[PDB]
Amino acid sequence: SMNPPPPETSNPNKPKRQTNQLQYLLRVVLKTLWKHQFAWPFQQPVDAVKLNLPDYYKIIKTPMDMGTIKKRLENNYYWNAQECIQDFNTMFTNCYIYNKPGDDIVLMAEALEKLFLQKINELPTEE
Numbered sequence: 001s002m003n004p005p006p007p008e009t010s011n012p013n014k015p016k017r018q019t020n021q022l023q024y025l026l027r028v029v030l031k032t033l034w035k036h037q038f039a040w041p042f043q044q045p046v047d048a049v050k051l052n053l054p055d056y057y058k059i060i061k062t063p064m065d066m067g068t069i070k071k072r073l074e075n076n077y078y079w080n081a082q083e084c085i086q087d088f089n090t091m092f093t094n095c096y097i098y099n100k101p102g103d104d105i106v107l108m109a110e111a112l113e114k115l116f117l118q119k120i121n122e123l124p125t126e127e
C-alpha cells in the first residue's frame with residue numbers, strides 16, 4: 001500500500017550522449033504526448049497512497065511515467081533511442097496490466113500510444 005521510491009532519473013557514472021534520435025524523442029515524442037488532454041495521469045509516478053490503490057505496486061514491478069521520462073531525456077540519461085522507447089512501452093503496458101479494458105485510464109493510454117506510434121514511425125535515421 002506504500003509508494004516505492006521513484007525510478008532513477010540521474011546516474012552520474014552512466015555514460016551519456018546526445019543523438020538526433022534522442023533529441024527527437026524529447027522535442028517531438030515527449031512534447032506531443034505531454035501536451036495532450038489525456039497526459040495528466042501519466043505526468044508523474046502513480047501515487048498509490050493518494051489514489052488508494054494499495055495493490056498497484058504489488059502488481060507493477062517496473063513503474064514508469066512520463067515525468068520520469070521527461071527528466072531522463074532532459075538529464076541526457078539515455079545512451080540510445082531504444083532505451084527511451086522501452087520506457088514509454090513499459091508505461092503503457094503497466095496501465096494495460098493493472099487496469100481493465102474500457103477503463104478511462106486505458107482509453108487514455110490507448111490515445112497516447114497511438115500518437116506515440118505515429119511519431120516513432122518517423123524517428124529520424126541516426127546521423
Ligand SMILES: CCOc1cc(-c2c(C)noc2C)cc([C@@H](C)O)c1
Pocket residue numbers: 040041042046051053095098099104105108
Ligand atoms: C494523477 C493520477 O490520476 C489518475 C491515475 C489513474 C491510474 C493510472 C495512471 N494507472 O492506474 C490508474 C488507476 C487513473 C486515473 C483516472 C483516469 O481514472 C487518474
